[PDB]
């Protein structure tokens, strides 16, 4: 099936600050699946703008 | 006069046991993102 | 006069047991991103 | 005059035992995101 | 004059024992998100 | 007069058990990115 | 089926601050499934804007 | 079926502060399933705006 | 069926502060099921706005 | 299936600050799957703008 | 004059023993989220 | 299948600041999958602009 967990000590979408900290931790990384529409931006600017429109698709699975 | 249009006509699909998607989409223009 | 158009006509698909996508999309022009 | 339109006509689907999606969507234009 | 419209007409679906979705959606334009 | 158009006509696809994509797209011109 | 858990000590969508902390922890990472529509932005700007519209699809599963 | 739990010590949507804390913990990560519509934003800005409209789909399962 | 529990010590939607705490714990992570409509935002901004409209679908199951 | 976890100590979408910190940590890296539409930007500018439109595709899997 | 409309007409569905959804939705435009 | 994890201590989309820090760490690198559309920019400018439109494709897998 889809997106199940077993075994020992496995993790999805983890929180910040798992090590030793005397400063600032913010956010984390990203993971995406197959058969998807996902325009993407990674930016260290002073000002940043993302603008997207008009997306169509079937997005379907048959397993009879 | 200014015109954007989609025309989609007549789907014949009797005794359907699988999967079907019949999709029509129309999107307007002249869009303007501004970063000063 | 200024015109953008999609015409899509007649899908014959009886006894369908697989997967089908029938898709029509129309998008307008004259878009302008500005960085000053 | 300014016009955006979707026309979708006549679905014949008797004795349906599978899955079907009949979908029509119309979206207006001239949208403007601004970052100053 | 300014016009957005969806026209969808006549579904013939007697003795239906599966699943069917007949869906029509119309959405207006000229939307404007502003970040100052 | 200025014109951009896509015409796509008649798909015959009975007893479909595989995968099919029927796709039509029309995009307007005269777009202008400016960096000052 | 979809999204079930078994085994020992498995986790989904974890909270911040699992390590040792003397500063700030905020948020975490992200995980997405198949057959999906998901435009995405990761940004360290001074100002940030995301804008998206007009998304259509069947999004279906048959298992007869 | 959908979304059931068995086994030993399994977890879904966990709370913050499972470790040792002398600072701040806020929020956590995210996990999403199949056959879905989900535009997404992860941002460390000074100001942030998300805007989305017009979403259609069947979203269905048959298992006769 | 849908969303049942058995076995030993399993959990859904857990509360904050399961570890050892001398600071602040707030909230937790998130888990979503299949066949769903869910636009999403994760943000560490100074100001944040989410706006969504116009969502349609069948959302159905047949098991005769 | 799609996006499942087993084994020991595996991770997806990790949080910042797993080492030793006396400064600033922000964000992380990115990983994308197959069969996808994803225009991308990585920028260290003073000002940055991304603009994208008009994306179509089937995005489907059959496994009968 | 400004107009948004959905027209959906005549469903023939006698002796129905499965599941059917007949759905019509119309949504107005010119919406504006502002973040200052 | 697609995008699963096993073994010991493996990672996807990691957070900044895994070493020893007395300065600034921001962002990270990027990894992309097969069968995809992804125009890309890496820039150290004073001002930067990316603009993209009109992308079409099937993006599909059959494994019957």
How would you describe what is shown here?
The complex is a heterododecamer, with 6 copies of chain A (64 residues) and 6 copies of chain B (36 residues). The two termini of chain A are 14 Å apart. With 64 residues, chain A is an all-beta fold. Chain B is mostly beta strands and 36 residues long. Chain B is 0% helix and 61% strand. Chain B contains no helices and 3 strands. Chains A and C meet through strand 6 of A and strand 2 of C. It is classed as protein fibril.
List keywords for this structure.
heterododecamer, A: 64 residues, B: 36 residues, mainly beta, elongated
Alpha carbon gap, first and last residue of chain A? 14 Å
Please count the beta strands of chain A (DSSP E, at least 2 residues each).
7
Measure the end-to-end span of chain B. 32 Å
Globally, the shape of chain B reads: elongated
Determine Rg of chain B (CA atoms, Å): 18 Å
Q: What's the total count of β strands of chain B?
A: 3
Q: Please bin the fraction of helical residues of chain B.
A: under 10%
| Helix and strand composition category of chain A | mainly beta
Task: Tell me about the largest β-sheet of chain B.
Answer: none
What's the main sheet of chain A like? none
Radius of gyration of chain A: 18 Å
Task: Work out the helicity level of chain A.
Answer: under 10%
Strand/helix succession of chain B:
EEE
Strand content of chain B: over 45%
Proportion of β residues of chain A? 35-45%
The DSSP helix count of chain A reads 0
Described by the principal axes of the CA atoms, the overall outline of chain A is flat
What's the number of helices of chain B? 0
> So what's the oligomer here?
heterododecamer
Protein name (chains A, G, H, I, J, L): TAR DNA-binding protein 43
Biased composition (Gly residues) (chains A, G, H, I, J, L): 1-22
Modified residues (Omega-N-methylarginine) (chains A, G, H, I, J, L): 12
Subcellular location (chains A, G, H, I, J, L): Nucleus; Cytoplasm; Cytoplasm, Stress granule; Mitochondrion
């Amino acid at each position: 099936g889809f997106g199940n967990q077993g075994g020992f000590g496995n993790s999805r979408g983890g929180g910040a600050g798992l090590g030793n900290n005397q400063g600032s931790n913010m956010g984390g990384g990203m993971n995406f699946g197959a058969f998807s529409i996902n325009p993407a931006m990674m930016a260290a600017a002073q000002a940043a703008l993302q603008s997207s429109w008009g997306m169509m698709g079937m997005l379907a699975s048959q397993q009879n | 006069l200014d015109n954007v249009a989609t025309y989609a006509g007549q789907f014949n699909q009797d005794y359907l046991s699988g999967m079907a998607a019949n999709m029509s989409g129309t999107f307007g223009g002249a869009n303007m993102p501004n970063l000063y």
